[PDB]
Design a protein around this ligand. Sequence first.
Ligand SMILES: O=C(O)c1cnc2c(cnn2C2CCCC2)c1
Length: 210
Amino acid sequence: TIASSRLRLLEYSAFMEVQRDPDTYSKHLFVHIGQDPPLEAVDVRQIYDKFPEKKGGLKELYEKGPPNAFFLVKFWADLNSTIQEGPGAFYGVSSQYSSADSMTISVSTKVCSFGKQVVEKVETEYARLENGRFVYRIHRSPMCEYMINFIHKLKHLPEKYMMNSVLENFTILQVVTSRDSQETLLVIAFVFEVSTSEHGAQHHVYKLVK
Ligand SMILES: O=C(O)c1cnc2c(cnn2C2CCCC2)c1
């Protein structure tokens, strides 16, 4: 469970959806996190090299704190072409959060490639009271053309070891802050590999410590 003292990640999924006919849709999940067990710890200094981006970077954010907001998710992305991709295929990202307190949050998603920030998405979300808790939803946020082209380039590689060498240099840094106070609520560093398993995409969550 990815949760700080102020915010919990309920769900996260990167996917592509193709419309076979007006009433039929197929959805392929590249990565997914759904739905508390104790988490294994990873020293944050072991991944500073993987996130070398200076301003809005990991080292600076960790020093600002609180340390309880920092998590690392290692993904094994399912890049198998299970669904037949056609012309109007939608590539998107959906995520949900919850908190005990009502807040306006700001979700910044930094996509990095070769140690350089390539895309940054900033989305403001308002609290919705739901079953005594406050929920935040980012539904079907479209992937930018950079990310759709990166996935095609990855799928067109003749070997899964070649895709791992590319994914070695690809990271995503998600920073959720309170909109008005600018306080760090949740930080998730994402690192990637290609899934070799028949059980599809897999992930491992770690608590970042110092
Ligand atoms: O927020 C985004 O735009 C975004 C773009 N691409 C993403 C994710 C999560 N996984 N992936 C790809 C890595 C390789 C498989 C799919 C999120």
